[PDB]
Ligand binder design. Structure first.
Ligand SMILES: [Cl-]
Ligand SMILES: [Cl-]
Ligand SMILES: [Cl-]
Ligand SMILES: [Cl-]
Ligand SMILES: [K+]
Ligand SMILES: [Mg+2]
Ligand SMILES: [Mg+2]
Ligand SMILES: [Mg+2]
Ligand SMILES: [Mg+2]
Ligand SMILES: [Mg+2]
Ligand SMILES: [Mg+2]
Ligand SMILES: [Mg+2]
Ligand SMILES: [Mg+2]
Ligand SMILES: [Mg+2]
Ligand SMILES: [Mg+2]
Ligand SMILES: [Mg+2]
Ligand SMILES: [Mg+2]
Ligand SMILES: [Mg+2]
Ligand SMILES: [Mg+2]
Ligand SMILES: [Mg+2]
Ligand SMILES: [Mg+2]
Ligand SMILES: [Mg+2]
Ligand SMILES: [Mg+2]
Ligand SMILES: [Mg+2]
Ligand code: NA
Ligand code: NA
Ligand code: NA
Ligand code: NA
Ligand code: NA
Ligand code: NA
Ligand code: NA
Ligand code: NA
Ligand code: NA
Ligand code: NA
Ligand code: NA
Lengths: 237, 56, 92, 194
RNA sequence: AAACAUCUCAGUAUCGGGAGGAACAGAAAACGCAAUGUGAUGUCGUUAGUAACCGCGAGUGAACGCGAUACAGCCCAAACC
RNA sequence: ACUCGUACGGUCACUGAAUCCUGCCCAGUGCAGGUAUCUGAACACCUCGUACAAGAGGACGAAGGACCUGUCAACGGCGGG
RNA sequence: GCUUUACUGCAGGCUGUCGCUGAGGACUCUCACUCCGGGAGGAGGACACCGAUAGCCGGGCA
């Protein structure tokens, strides 16, 4: 047969690549020598092409100008602060240790210094549950309990743009446009709508997968399609 | 649209050009590589044992 | 069928009739040191192994008589032609 | 009496023993942070080098080379093949790692010629060899009676033709008798069956 | 191989790197007509379609020696300085 | 590559606006988890064998499987009397 | 060309073992090794990666 679509992707040709050149900024927390003294002002609120959510322009004291992963409720003129002694208000960043348990956070570092990895998309937020001198327990948007070094810096509040997912695209044309700002091939052709030579589900007088859709974790690429290592399917039970 | 005659009309692009190195009109000006001597790809001249019969 | 454990018959070694004991030939265990063992190891590689890539033949509806005939005095045994017997039970 | 060299040799018989054992654990860290081909002022195995033809002379160079360990880094067939030839993982090249090293070292030095080489250990995934290379154009070598043979035109690019030390050994040319039927005088002349 | 997988075509086609006017090999940790024998290496003739391999199928296939050609034998490392 | 991306994400599939709906079956096959016991390769280990070696046998036992459970908006099924 | 519980193999995934590999049937440590940090330093750690092999699955492919 021929390689299936999931195999073409990995090559990274234009069609599957993100329009990087069109993106604005790689949102990451600032690096502070220490002290926390680093503060700045919100100069402007812009639209982030890569995330379809708002992004704040900030001017720091030492002249640095950089775009920031913005928490709901930040506005022009506001002052943010980044450090161990940063105030505890929305838009500010400081280690989970200095943060008060029970508060909504976002853009949480997986390891101190990485600049933030978790909870960064539209309207999401992590939940700081437990403290300690060794482990800071956080509940990520998926619901999973994540154990994190208390040194990991995070931002206070919930990411901006909440409620996006609420309104339907209503028409292909809309998806189209959204999908053109993303490293994805759109539209998508159902595998059962292809030929045998093109996809494990292709072929047949009528449209139905040949074998059962749940496939093994060990199935190799080219064959791993359908319901991947599904622990169950359906809705019953 | 016919792949034949009608599709022949749009052919006004320039690709292969007189080669600075070999003098053959094979220097692809878009690839900047010669399909005949390999100028722009190989310091050595493009040459293959299959350009002639096995025992010759 | 049935077949006497012991009985008088011709012995090829003694060169005379005497009492012989019939027993079924117990298969003998291989040492895995014959020439075909070393050629298997040697010849097997990437992809198919040829003859060594084939599997066990099959079974005939019935097998022939695989016995041993041990002479009662000299103790030396001799092999005889086997005959198709779906079953062979000795009498005593 | 024993030559001082005799002690270096002696320590490299069991490189995972005693002091040399600790030296390696040391160096190998700096080694893994170095390039593929690094020129060195002095051989790490002085008896070994000198034994191979090394001298403390102008025009003589020594270098360390790192090569990956294991079998062939081979791509799987993209077309028809019988099962015997569908092989990938168990294919190993016919040119040992020492010989790749000698070559990578030679290319790094286009004007130099390979004199000989020797292994200097290996870790989980590298293999290191130090290679001795001679400048066939430098007088002092052209004027040395025990090395000037490498200056001859007929020696241009020795490694690449297998005229090296390990080159000939890897070529099955060790024995002069039984077993070298398809080896001598050259593999190619023997239909390449060795 | 009257299919075909090991085998064969064949280390062939084809690809990568490179030498010279020729390359390559080469003065035995050899041979083993077992000897009180031979004496670097190529190549040629023969040994021989022999020994050896092989779904022991189809096929594959040397060497020692011998008769010739041409002949040539040396340099380090170390010890001791 | 996805990715200047972080679950309001993006990957992999099915159905194909709205509206009213979407039942029964986990035996087989698939996926997933569990598993006393059974099965389960090589190294290292023990016994025999060999002045060594081949080799025969033992102890231990991973993933996998037997066995159990979940699962049909998973492949599919929804009969005769 | 295509398919599969046709035959024989191949990639790939999972798993045991050996090497890298170190100190005091369950465990601690740090020094290799890996990752994070601009650095100081932090996490992990003799595992993982990588090399070798062994069993299972294996129309993704021949
Ligand atoms: Cl979307
Ligand atoms: Cl019987
Ligand atoms: Cl060279
Ligand atoms: Cl003789
Ligand atoms: K063939
Ligand atoms: Mg980024
Ligand atoms: Mg949706
Ligand atoms: Mg609209
Ligand atoms: Mg696009
Ligand atoms: Mg579709
Ligand atoms: Mg169709
Ligand atoms: Mg297919
Ligand atoms: Mg349909
Ligand atoms: Mg359908
Ligand atoms: Mg056409
Ligand atoms: Mg095989
Ligand atoms: Mg020749
Ligand atoms: Mg045929
Ligand atoms: Mg036949
Ligand atoms: Mg042959
Ligand atoms: Mg001989
Ligand atoms: Mg849909
Ligand atoms: Mg890094
Ligand atoms: Mg096929
Ligand atoms: Na189909
Ligand atoms: Na062999
Ligand atoms: Na060179
Ligand atoms: Na050979
Ligand atoms: Na035929
Ligand atoms: Na045919
Ligand atoms: Na054969
Ligand atoms: Na004679
Ligand atoms: Na079922
Ligand atoms: Na089931
Ligand atoms: Na066809």
């Amino acid at each position: 047969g021929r390689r299936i679509q999931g195999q073409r992707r990995g090559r990274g040709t234009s069609t599957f690549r993100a329009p990087s050149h069109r993106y604005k900024a790689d949102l990451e927390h600032r690096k502070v020598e220490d002290g926390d003294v680093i503060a700045g002002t919100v100069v402007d609120i812009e639209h982030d092409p890569a995330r379809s959510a708002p992004v704040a322009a900030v001017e720091f004291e030492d002249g640095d100008r950089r775009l920031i992963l913005a928490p709901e409720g930040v506005g022009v003129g506001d002052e943010l602060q980044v450090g161990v002694d940063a105030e505890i208000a929305p838009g500010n960043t400081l280690p989970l240790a200095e943060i008060p348990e029970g508060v909504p956070v976002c853009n949480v570092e997986s390891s101190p210094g990485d600049g933030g990895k978790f909870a960064r998309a539209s309207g999401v937020n992590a939940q700081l549950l437990t403290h300690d001198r060794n482990v800071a327990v956080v509940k990520l948007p998926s619901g999973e309990m994540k154990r994190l070094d208390p040194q990991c810096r995070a931002t206070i509040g919930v990411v901006g743009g909440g409620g996006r997912t609420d309104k339907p695209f209503v028409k292909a044309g809309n998806k189209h446009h959204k999908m053109k700002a993303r490293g994805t091939k759109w539209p998508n052709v159902r595998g059962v709508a292809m030929n045998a030579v093109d996809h494990p589900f292709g072929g047949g007088g009528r449209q139905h997968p040949g074998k059962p859709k749940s496939i093994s974790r060990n199935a190799p690429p080219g064959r791993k399609v359908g319901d991947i290592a599904s622990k169950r399917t359906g809705r019953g039970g | 649209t016919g792949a034949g005659t009608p599709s022949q009309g749009k052919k006004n692009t320039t690709t292969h050009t007189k080669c600075r190195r070999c003098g053959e009109k094979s220097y692809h000006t878009k690839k900047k590589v010669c399909s005949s001597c390999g100028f722009g790809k190989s310091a050595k001249r493009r040459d293959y044992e299959w350009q002639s019969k096995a025992g010759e | 069928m049935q077949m006497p454990r012991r009985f008088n018959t011709y012995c090829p070694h003694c060169n005379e009739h005497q009492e012989h004991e019939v027993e079924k030939v117990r298969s003998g265990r291989q040492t895995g040191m014959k020439w075909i063992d070393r050629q298997r190891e040697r010849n097997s590689g990437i992809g198919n192994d040829g003859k060594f890539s084939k599997v066990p033949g099959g079974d005939k509806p019935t097998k022939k008589t695989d016995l041993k005939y041990r002479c009662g005095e000299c103790g030396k045994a001799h092999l005889r032609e086997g005959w198709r017997a779906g079953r062979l039970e000795f009498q005593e | 009496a024993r030559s001082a060299y005799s002690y270096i040799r002696e320590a490299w018989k069991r490189p995972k023993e005693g002091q040399i054992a600790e030296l390696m654990w040391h160096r190998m860290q700096e080694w893994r942070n170095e390039p593929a081909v690094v020129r060195i002022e002095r051989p790490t195995r002085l008896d070994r080098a000198r034994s191979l033809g090394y001298k403390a002379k102008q025009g003589i160079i020594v270098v360390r080379v790192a090569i990956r360990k294991g079998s062939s880094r081979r791509t799987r067939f993209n077309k028809g093949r019988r099962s015997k030839r569908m092989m990938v993982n168990r294919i190993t090249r016919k040119k040992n790692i020492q010989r790749i090293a000698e070559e990578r070292a030679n290319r790094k030095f286009p004007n130099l010629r390979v004199l000989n080489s020797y292994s200097v250990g290996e870790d989980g995934r590298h293999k290191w060899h130090e290679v001795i290379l001679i400048d066939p154009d430098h007088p002092a070598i052209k004027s040395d009676d025990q090395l000037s043979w490498i200056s001859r035109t007929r020696h241009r690019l020795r490694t690449f033709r297998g005229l090296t030390s390990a080159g000939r050994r890897c070529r099955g040319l060790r024995g002069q008798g039984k077993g070298s039927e398809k080896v001598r005088p050259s593999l190619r002349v023997n239909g390449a069956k060795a």
